[PDB]
């Protein structure tokens, strides 16, 4: 099956705790963006934190576009935005094609720098390891997972942990924002294992 790298991005949004020194334009931006559920979604919008989602989507797009620069293709991805116990964060799965594991660190470092400039007005987020490549173990190699990781680990999340998801993988397009479809794929995954 298709192989992917996973980068978890903790989403900064608090001007005191995460982004000291940022201008008013940040709060104005995240406060003014209205989100609507697509017709095919069955999510409860009241459980979705829009200001954080606004930052998350921008991070996702900037990350992917920068990744495409390195992969030199429209890389396949599955990105899931979640409200964790400590941080809102993105599980960013991007296919390995065109990106060697030894150079991934430098690439992701460059992507982080781009995020700081574009999304955060040059302000460094005060969150520990806010852009982290998932490793096999501490100090180990960059973890590589296949498509199965999606239905096995990401699709099972429900609201409010699950906040939103995006993908250009046809197999998961419907599942991204549909709990019933996620339920179907999770069931299918268990049956096959
Ligand atoms: Cl967390
Ligand atoms: Zn591809
Ligand atoms: Zn998570």
């Amino acid at each position: 099956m298709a192989t992917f790298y996973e980068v978890i991005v903790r989403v900064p949004f608090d001007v005191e705790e995460h982004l000291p020194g940022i201008s008013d334009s940040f709060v104005d931006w995240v406060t003014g963006q209205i989100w609507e559920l697509p017709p095919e979604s069955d999510l409860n919008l009241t459980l979705v934190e829009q200001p954080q989602l606004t930052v998350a989507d921008r991070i996702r797009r900037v990350f992917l576009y920068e990744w495409n620069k390195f992969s030199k293709q429209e890389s396949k991805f599955f990105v899931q935005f979640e409200k964790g116990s400590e941080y809102f964060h993105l599980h960013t799965l991007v296919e390995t094609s065109g990106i060697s594991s030894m150079v991934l660190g430098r690439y992701v470092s460059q992507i982080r720098a781009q995020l700081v400039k574009v999304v955060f007005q040059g302000i460094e987020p005060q969150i520990n390891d806010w852009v982290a490549i998932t490793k096999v173990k501490k100090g180990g190699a960059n973890k590589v997972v296949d498509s199965g990781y999606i239905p096995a680990y990401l699709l099972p999340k429900v609201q409010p942990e699950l906040q939103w998801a995006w993908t250009n993988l046809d197999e998961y397009k419907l599942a991204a924002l549909n709990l019933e479809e996620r339920k179907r794929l999770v069931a299918q995954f268990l049956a096959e294992s």
Side-chain angles (χ1 to χ4, degrees):
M1 304 191 99
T3 57
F4 302 80
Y5 285 124
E6 180 186 59
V7 180
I8 294 177
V9 181
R10 288 172 170 170
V11 179
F13 68 87
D14 196 299
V15 302
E16 184 203 5
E17 292 286 309
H18 307 152
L19 301 159
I22 202 154
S23 80
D24 290 6
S25 68
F26 180 79
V27 172
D28 293 344
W29 168 45
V30 306
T31 298
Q33 179 67 61
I34 306 291
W35 285 82
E36 292 187 337
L37 294 168
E40 299 176 70
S41 179
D42 62 359
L43 296 177
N44 178 356
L45 192 62
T46 65
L47 296 178
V48 177
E49 303 302 330
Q50 294 182 45
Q52 287 83 0
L53 175 56
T54 296
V55 181
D57 188 59
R58 187 56 54 81
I59 289 176
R60 175 193 68 96
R61 295 177 186 272
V62 171
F63 184 106
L64 294 171
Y65 299 167
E66 205 66 15
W67 185 281
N68 292 167
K69 179 188 63 169
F70 299 123
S71 65
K72 291 184 185 299
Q73 62 161 286
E74 181 76 0
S75 300
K76 289 297 184 173
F77 66 85
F78 185 90
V79 179
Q80 183 159 288
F81 184 42
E82 297 174 6
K83 181 178 192 299
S85 45
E86 276 70 72
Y87 305 93
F88 280 87
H89 59 280
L90 292 157
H91 283 264
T92 317
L93 293 178
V94 190
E95 75 179 315
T96 59
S97 193
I99 313 290
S100 71
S101 189
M102 78 177 311
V103 76
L104 185 63
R106 200 188 69 219
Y107 285 175
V108 172
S109 180
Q110 288 179 50
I111 297 178
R112 178 171 59 236
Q114 174 71 347
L115 290 173
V116 171
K117 291 188 291 187
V118 177
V119 193
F120 307 111
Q121 310 171 16
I123 300 299
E124 295 283 350
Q126 298 306 295
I127 295 182
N128 185 51
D129 302 317
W130 74 282
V131 177
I133 301 169
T134 302
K135 313 288 184 168
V136 175
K137 59 190 179 183
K138 178 181 177 176
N142 296 316
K143 194 184 192 69
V144 172
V145 298
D146 57 49
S147 310
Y149 180 84
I150 296 168
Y153 189 63
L154 302 181
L155 297 194
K157 274 78 185 301
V158 296
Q159 297 185 274
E161 182 179 354
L162 169 62
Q163 289 282 312
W164 208 267
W166 306 259
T167 186
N168 59 356
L169 293 166
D170 296 328
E171 183 182 7
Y172 301 111
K173 283 181 171 296
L174 176 56
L177 303 178
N178 192 282
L179 296 161
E180 199 62 49
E181 174 68 355
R182 285 169 173 251
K183 187 176 176 182
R184 183 184 74 80
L185 293 177
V186 169
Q188 181 179 261
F189 182 83
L190 297 196
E192 298 174 2
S193 56

